[PDB]
Structures are given as C-alpha cells and as structure tokens.
Design a protein around this nucleic acid. Structure first.
Ligand SMILES: [Mg+2]
Ligand SMILES: [Mg+2]
Ligand SMILES: [Mg+2]
Ligand SMILES: [Mg+2]
Ligand SMILES: [Mg+2]
Ligand SMILES: [Mg+2]
Ligand SMILES: [Mg+2]
Ligand SMILES: [Mg+2]
Ligand SMILES: [Mg+2]
Ligand SMILES: [Zn+2]
Lengths: 36, 146, 92, 229
RNA sequence: GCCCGCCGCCUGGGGAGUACGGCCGCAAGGCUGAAACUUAAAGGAAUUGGCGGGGGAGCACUACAAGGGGUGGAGCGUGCGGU
RNA sequence: ACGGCUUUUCCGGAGUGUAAAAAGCUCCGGGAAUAAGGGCUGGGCAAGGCCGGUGGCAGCCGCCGCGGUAAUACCGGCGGCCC
C-alpha cells in the first residue's frame, strides 16, 4: 500500500495498523469469490 | 530542493510538458475538460426544469438548529428522474397539491449545491401551475383551477 | 382527555429502537415502527410500556406511524373507569 | 497654522524637561524638526514632538487603525484587555505608528497615540514612474519593499492623479505621510492588520537605504522632509 | 542564507490507497490507480489557565498518627422524602 | 397654501416625407394636464436600538449565524439606504 503518514496520528480514529489488517482480511474474501 | 527546473534556453518542450502534466491535479480543470458534471446532472445542464409532484415530505434541520422544512418529491418530465425540491415561504406548502406541475431551479448554495441547514436538497420551487409561488404566498393572485 | 380521531388509535410501546424511534403495538394487531415528533420529543420522557396515540402515515399506513400524545397514570385510571381501555390491551 | 504656533508656545513654557534632548529643545539650541534625526539620540519625551511638530495634534492628522480585545484565562473567569493600533503624521514628510494597551478603550487610545509620536520617522518622496516624469513629490521616488510577519509589501511609483492603489490601512498610512499616488503588490496574510501596517511602515522607512547620486536628485525631484516651497 | 544547473513529487478534509483493468510473485503479497456521494473546516507552531493513578516545597483535629468521649441497635422530641 | 410660466411628452389639425402608407421633421389650437418601480435594512456592506404579532413552533440563512415569551436578524406597520 501507499504511505499516508497523516493516517498514523491517533486523534479521532483507531490505530492504522489494525485498519490495514481489516482491509487485507476483506480483500481476501473478494478474491476467493472471484475465483469461483 | 534546488533551483526550479528546467531554465535552459532550448528546454521549451520539457517545460510545456511539465506544466501540462501537473495541471491535472487541479480539480476545477479536470471536471471541466472531462465534463464530469454533465454526466451526472439530472437537469442536463439546464438552468430550470419542469416536473410533476408525487408527494409531500418534511426534513429536519441539522444540529444545532431545530425545525421541519417542507419539501416535495418531483418527477422530471424530460427524463423521468425523481428529485427533492424545497418550498420557500411561510405556509407555502398549503398551495401545493399532489399531481400539480411545478418549475424548479437551483437553490444557490456553495459550489452549485445545497445551502444552509438542509443538505441533501439542491432545488427549490418557483412556479405552481404556471403561477409564481412568491405571489401566492404574498397574495395578489389566486391559484388557478381551484 | 383527548381521544383518537380518524386513523388515530391506541397503542402500547413495545421497544425502543433508538434515534427517536419506537416500536408500538396497536389495538388491531399491527406492529408499527413509529417516529417521535420533535415538538413533543423535547418535553416529555417516555418509557417502555405506555399508552400513546398512534397516527398512521398518509403513505404506507401499515408499518409506519407517529406518536402524537401520551397519557398519565391518573388519565389511565380515568379511561379505565370510563370504559375505553381494558386490562387485556394494557397486558397485550 | 496660527493655532499651533501658540499651542507650541504654551506647551514650551510650562514643560520641565527630564532628558538631555529635552533640555536642548527647551533652551532653544534645537529649533527644527530635522535636527533630531540621524545622530543616534534617544527620544523619550512626547513634548519634543509637540514643540517641533505641533500639527500632529490636529484631529485630521491622527488615525485609529484598529481596535481589538484579547482574553487571558484564569480560574475566576476571563480578563479582558484592549489593544489599539494608531498612527500620526504631518501630511508632509513625517509619520509615526504606535500600539497601546489598557483596561479600557480610552486609556489604550491615549497610550497608542503617545507611542506613535515617539516612533516618528522621516522619508523621501519624488516621482519615478515611466509614464509621469514631473519632478514633483507626489509619490515614492522608486520601488521599495518591506515585510513583517508573513506580510510582504512592494510599493511602485505611479502617475499623478492615479490615486492610492492599495488596501485601506496602506491608504491611511500613506496619506498621513504626504503621498498621493502609488501602485502596490502584496503577499501573505493581509487580514492581520498589525503586520500589514508594520510592513507598510517599514517599506516607507526603507527609502533611506537606497544609494543615490546627485543627478538622480535632480532627475526625480527627491525631497527629504518638508517640501519647502 | 545569496546565486548558476538537472531530475522526482504536491494542489482543502473524507470516500481511498478502495473499485475496475494491467504487469510481477509458488503463495503471502508488490507496483500503477478513479468516480458517485459527503463535509466547513481538517492540519501546524506558540500563549494563559485547569487537570495528571508526574516531580519538588508548605499547611489543616470540619486531615491523619497518639488519645478522651460518642453516633449507627431500643423508645420518644423535632425537621425531611413518600403516601 | 397662494400667484405666475412652459409644452419635451399627451389630444386634435396643415405641410413635408414615402413605390403607396406609417414613423420622423417644420407650424397651428387646448392643457400641469397623460406618466415610478424593484431589491435591501445584525456583520461583510450604505441604511432603525421604534411599534404590533409568533414563542426551538412557524420561519430566515451565498458564508458567519438568528429564533427556548423583554427578537435592532422571522411576519406586518411606520421610518430609512442603493440603483
Ligand atoms: Mg505531511
Ligand atoms: Mg487557581
Ligand atoms: Mg520576522
Ligand atoms: Mg487486479
Ligand atoms: Mg471528616
Ligand atoms: Mg486516629
Ligand atoms: Mg440510634
Ligand atoms: Mg422590518
Ligand atoms: Mg454601516
Ligand atoms: Zn509624477
């Protein structure tokens, strides 16, 4: 992914690391359904 | 960062290319050249439109204001799409009846969009059955065909 | 003291869905997802299991409505003495 | 002018100087306004300007540039303070700018007027526009620049009768110094009035830092201080 | 900092480093990258206070430590909530 | 309010005009007679700290913001400002 160091600031949002993990989990499911 | 480049006497092509390349980062230029507004405009570039009323509704103002704003759902004659139009004036909603025809135009907010404490409404009613709504609100005239 | 008129009827609050939305069982057998008008939303607190006046919406008068008036315990007893509300309706 | 002569005479007799320059003015060893500049003196008594430039007390020679109120936070609430930015001049060759603070508006205005007199400077005027070569002191003699905070100001000579093509703060400051026509360019945040005024003031002061030859004085009609017809 | 060169990048905050297409990789993943719609601020440096399960100095029997006597359990006097 | 004046414009005629007409232009008779609206009025931004309604309702609001029974900001009256 591309870097947005502004997203790492914690004021008014959750941690960027776990958002990235959640997005990567979401993208796996779409890829699996595409192969079917 | 060093001096701005290119500055050479015979470097016109690169300079023109650079200026053209970074002009696409301007959002106003991009929307005009690619004609993005015309692709999604329900009014199809017109300043006014004519439609038929389907029902009456009311919308709550945003915080920290309080109140109900009277609006109508309008189906456009030219393409059949359905939009929402605000009815300006004190008690103006009483002059609107279902299945009437109305003329609508932009409401006049920033960037050609909504205004005030009612986002989501982009239009306002101007005429009802070919009679000015402002007159009806003030008086001076009666709504035709009862 | 006020009484339902036209489409208005008696209802019992069943559940609070939040965001100024309530669930109300009417006196005919229809559960309606009702909205609390702002005029009376800023003055009277309402809890689960109270008698209110339900006015159906002019469009889709089968699942949506509004709450226009709430009665008090003394008014509930007065209506019970008059004979307009019954124990079965209160208990559902 | 007749009022101000007797006003200066009245001020002179009842004034007890406290500094060396005040003593020089009191004893009559200094008789002109131009003699207190360019020699490193310190100016600490407002009566010096009153005696030597009495017309800066005229109501038309004073300008209240801005008024603001600022807040200090305490456990017993908000403490309010007034800041006033003001300027004075003789509409011929001298101008001063000042800031005053106070608990109420009148005190701040008085102090701001008082400090403007102590910061007084003299400038140079002339005509250096390409399309007006008249040798009369109605504009700046050449392009000058000044800055303060984020504000940059550039002043460009203009033709006679053009007017002051600049924001209102610059209009007032330039008018108090005796300039009628100018062009200008700016960068930064002009809505910060204090920095805008200070930048214009510095640009006016920087007319003394440009090296010139005797031919240029004749060519542009450069005048230092009073026009002296 | 003042000047002489060349290449790379940015154009309010979100949607979004997402959708679609392409190349690379055994896989995990990498590089490239929009729109509808939404919003009046988001962001930076510094100031005065208030706060900290941060540090230091001082003080109080409506704080403690060392003590003397009690209230909270019963009946009654009187005041308050509720009915 | 009294007394006086003029006729661009208006009403009725003669000439000229025009392919023919109509406008236009020169004369004659009557007469102040025939002729002012639209927006705004809290700040930006010129203009009211006046009166009567409404009471987080109705409504206004390009933006900032008004309205919770003592509204210079909504509706109306009387004033005022710009063209
Ligand atoms: Mg950054
Ligand atoms: Mg304190
Ligand atoms: Mg500096
Ligand atoms: Mg792909
Ligand atoms: Mg204690
Ligand atoms: Mg103890
Ligand atoms: Mg006891
Ligand atoms: Mg008014
Ligand atoms: Mg004004
Ligand atoms: Zn000149």
């Amino acid at each position: 992914m591309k870097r947005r160091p502004r997203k790492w600031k914690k004021k008014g949002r959750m941690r960027w690391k776990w958002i990235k993990k959640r997005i990567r989990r979401l993208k796996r499911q779409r890829k699996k359904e595409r192969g079917l | 960062p060093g001096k701005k480049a290119p500055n050479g006497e015979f470097a016109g092509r690169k300079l023109k290319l650079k200026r053209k390349k970074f002009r696409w980062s301007d959002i106003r230029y991009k929307r005009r050249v690619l004609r993005l507004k015309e692709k999604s405009d329900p009014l199809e570039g017109a300043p006014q439109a004519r439609g038929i009323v389907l029902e009456k509704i009311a919308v709550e103002a945003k915080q920290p204001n309080s109140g109900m704003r009277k609006a109508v759902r309008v189906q456009l004659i030219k393409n059949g799409k359905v939009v929402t139009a605000f009815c300006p004036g004190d008690g103006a909603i009483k002059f609107i009846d279902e299945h009437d025809e109305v003329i609508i135009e932009g409401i006049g907010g920033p960037k050609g969009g909504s205004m005030g404490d009612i986002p989501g409404i982009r239009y306002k009613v101007v005429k009802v059955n070919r009679v000015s709504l402002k007159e009806l609100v003030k008086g001076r005239k009666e709504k035709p065909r009862r | 003291v006020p009484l339902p008129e036209g489409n208005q009827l008696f209802g019992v609050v069943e559940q609070a869905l939040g965001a100024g939305w309530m669930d109300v069982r009417c006196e005919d057998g229809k559960i309606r997802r009702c909205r609390i008008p702002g005029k009376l939303r800023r003055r009277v607190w309402i809890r689960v299991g109270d008698l209110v006046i339900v006015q159906p919406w002019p469009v889709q008068s089968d699942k949506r409505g509004d709450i226009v008036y709430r009665y008090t315990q003394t008014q509930v007893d007065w209506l019970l003495r008059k004979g307009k509300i019954t124990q079965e309706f209160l208990t559902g | 002018s007749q009022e101000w002569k007797e006003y200066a005479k009245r001020v002179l007799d009842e004034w007890q100087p406290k500094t060396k320059l005040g003593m020089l003015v009191k004893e009559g060893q200094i008789t002109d306004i131009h003699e207190i500049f360019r020699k490193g003196y310190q100016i600490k008594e407002p009566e010096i300007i009153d005696v030597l430039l009495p017309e800066v007390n005229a109501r038309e020679n004073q300008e209240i540039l801005d008024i603001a109120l600022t807040v200090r936070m305490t456990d017993s609430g908000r403490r309010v303070r007034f800041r006033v930015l003001a300027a004075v001049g003789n509409r011929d060759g001298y101008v001063g700018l000042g800031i005053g603070h106070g608990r109420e508006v009148g005190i701040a205005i008085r102090k701001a007027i008082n400090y403007a007199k102590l910061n007084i400077i003299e400038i140079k005027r002339g005509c250096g526009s390409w399309e007006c070569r008249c040798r009369r002191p109605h504009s700046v003699p050449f392009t000058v620049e000044g800055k303060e905070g984020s504000v940059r100001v550039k002043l460009i000579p203009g033709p006679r009768g053009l007017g002051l093509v600049i924001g209102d703060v610059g209009k007032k400051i330039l008018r108090l110094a005796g300039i009628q026509d100018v062009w200008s360019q700016t960068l930064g945040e002009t809505r910060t009035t204090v920095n805008f005024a200070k930048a214009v003031f510095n640009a006016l002061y920087n007319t003394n830092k440009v090296v010139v030859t005797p031919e240029m004085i004749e060519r542009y009609g450069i005048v230092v201080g009073r026009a002296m017809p």
